[PDB]
Design an enzyme around this catalytic site. Structure first.
Site, mmCIF file in Angstrom:
data_model
loop_
_atom_site.group_PDB
_atom_site.id
_atom_site.type_symbol
_atom_site.label_atom_id
_atom_site.label_comp_id
_atom_site.label_asym_id
_atom_site.label_seq_id
_atom_site.Cartn_x
_atom_site.Cartn_y
_atom_site.Cartn_z
ATOM 1 N N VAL B 27 0.825 -1.189 0.000
ATOM 2 C CA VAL B 27 0.000 0.000 0.000
ATOM 3 C C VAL B 27 0.864 1.244 0.000
ATOM 4 C CG1 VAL B 27 -0.688 0.981 2.225
ATOM 5 C CG2 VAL B 27 -2.426 0.078 0.650
ATOM 6 N N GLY B 28 2.162 1.046 -0.159
ATOM 7 C CA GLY B 28 3.068 2.174 -0.199
ATOM 8 C C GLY B 28 4.456 1.821 0.295
ATOM 9 N N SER B 29 5.412 2.630 -0.124
ATOM 10 C CA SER B 29 6.787 2.464 0.283
ATOM 11 C C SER B 29 7.105 3.821 0.862
ATOM 12 N N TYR B 32 11.343 5.292 5.155
ATOM 13 C CA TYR B 32 11.333 4.853 6.544
ATOM 14 C C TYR B 32 10.773 3.442 6.680
ATOM 15 N N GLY B 33 10.306 2.870 5.578
ATOM 16 C CA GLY B 33 9.772 1.519 5.613
ATOM 17 C C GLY B 33 8.603 1.344 4.659
ATOM 18 N N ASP B 165 0.312 8.698 12.808
ATOM 19 C CA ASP B 165 1.600 9.160 12.305
ATOM 20 C C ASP B 165 2.217 10.346 13.052
ATOM 21 O OD1 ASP B 165 1.521 7.148 10.474
ATOM 22 O OD2 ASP B 165 0.928 8.397 8.748
#
Lengths: 24, 339
Positions: B27-29, B32-33, B165
């Site tokens: 679902v995303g890169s 930071y991970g 977040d």
């Protein structure tokens, strides 16, 4: 997503607030 | 208590997770991970599994990894995203290198909701009330989010909201407080209250409040509404150069908010004036805002809980990479899941 009308929305927080608002 | 792990390479990257997590979808890169959405068969929830692959490449990284785990394990509140799980496929400290964090993937972000819908004043009251309920909890542990904006607020169909977040560093700038943008001084918990005012202002008007291009441009936009600093505030600015830059500006009175937000709930505008105060020491706190008349329908001083104390003594610790890694490992091992 589409947010329901607050009147139609139901969640623990609203439930709580509606229960206090009657005990009054 | 080690669960069974299964491994799979998704988009050129290896995920080794407990079998409870199914149907992983990248679902995303980031930097930071990587993040995957998944179905958590244990809770029946849709979740975000975040893999930190590079956790200990530096003292800065190692420490920030430890900080993020400490913060997340401390968050136990209805309006704040909590840790559902944290794990590593490592069977010992020596082979420990990867850390995975699991959080509830609730609804969509506020930015996404607004793009598809015009909220009512009712929605706005309840949404903002939930942000402040979450912030009173957070601020009570002396934690500052630092990075509040619409994209950091999860909201579902029933209008529930959770703050997510947290800023871990110790468009984006459009919600930042003047004093933190240019680093005028050490930040107050009320830098989050300033972001709240920015968010609420935008929910009511449907226009971003301070959409500046660079710091100076944004600062000027801010100071035009809120006025330029006075002697009181100037005494608080530690940087001599910033103070000299401030004095060089042509003075600007504060504007009256009632002309800027015509047709909006007057109570909403009143709260806006209390949140968007230039001097951080004079901005309304989250506890006080919850007591504001704008939230009359939702306020319950018996159900706006505070947090246990959060020990931030580690921030002043000066340790090796392997010591920060070991502290992190200990925190993974000591993690007790929520009911």
């Amino acid at each position: 997503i589409k947010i329901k009308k607050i009147e139609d929305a139901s969640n623990p927080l609203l439930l709580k607030r509606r229960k206090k608002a009657r005990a009054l | 208590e080690r669960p069974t792990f299964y491994r799979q390479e998704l988009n050129k990257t290896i995920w080794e997770v407990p079998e409870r997590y199914q149907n992983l979808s990248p679902v995303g890169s980031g930097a930071y991970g990587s993040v995957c959405a998944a179905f958590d068969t244990k809770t029946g929830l849709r979740v975000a599994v975040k893999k930190l692959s590079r956790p200990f490449q530096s003292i800065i990284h190692a420490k920030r990894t430890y900080r993020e785990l400490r913060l997340l394990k401390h968050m136990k509140h209805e309006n704040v995203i909590g840790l559902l799980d944290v794990f590593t496929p490592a069977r010992s400290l020596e082979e420990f290198n990867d850390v995975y964090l699991v959080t509830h993937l609730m609804g969509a972000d506020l930015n996404n909701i607004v793009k598809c819908q015009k909220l009512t004043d009712d929605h706005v009251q309840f949404l903002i009330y939930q942000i402040l309920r979450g912030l009173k909890y957070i601020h009570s542990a002396d934690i500052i989010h630092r990075d509040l904006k619409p994209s950091n607020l999860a909201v579902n169909e029933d209008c529930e909201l959770k703050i997510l977040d947290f800023g871990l560093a110790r468009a984006t700038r459009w919600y930042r407080a003047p004093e933190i943008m240019l680093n005028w001084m050490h930040y107050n918990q009320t830098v989050d209250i300033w972001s709240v005012g920015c968010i609420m202002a935008e929910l009511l008007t449907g226009r971003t409040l301070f959409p500046g291009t660079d710091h100076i441009d944004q600062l000027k936009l801010i100071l035009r509404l809120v006025g330029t600093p006075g002697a009181e505030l100037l005494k608080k600015i530690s940087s001599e150069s910033a103070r000299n830059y401030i004095q060089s500006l042509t003075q600007m009175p504060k504007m009256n908010f009632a002309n800027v937000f015509i047709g909006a709930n007057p109570l909403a505008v009143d709260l806006l004036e209390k949140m968007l105060v230039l001097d951080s020491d004079k901005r309304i706190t989250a506890a006080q805002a919850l007591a504001h008349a704008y939230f009359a329908q939702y306020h319950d001083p018996d159900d706006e809980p505070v947090a246990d104390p959060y020990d931030q003594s580690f921030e002043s610790r000066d340790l090796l990479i392997d010591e920060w890694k070991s502290l992190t490992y200990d925190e993974v091992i000591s993690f007790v899941p929520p009911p």
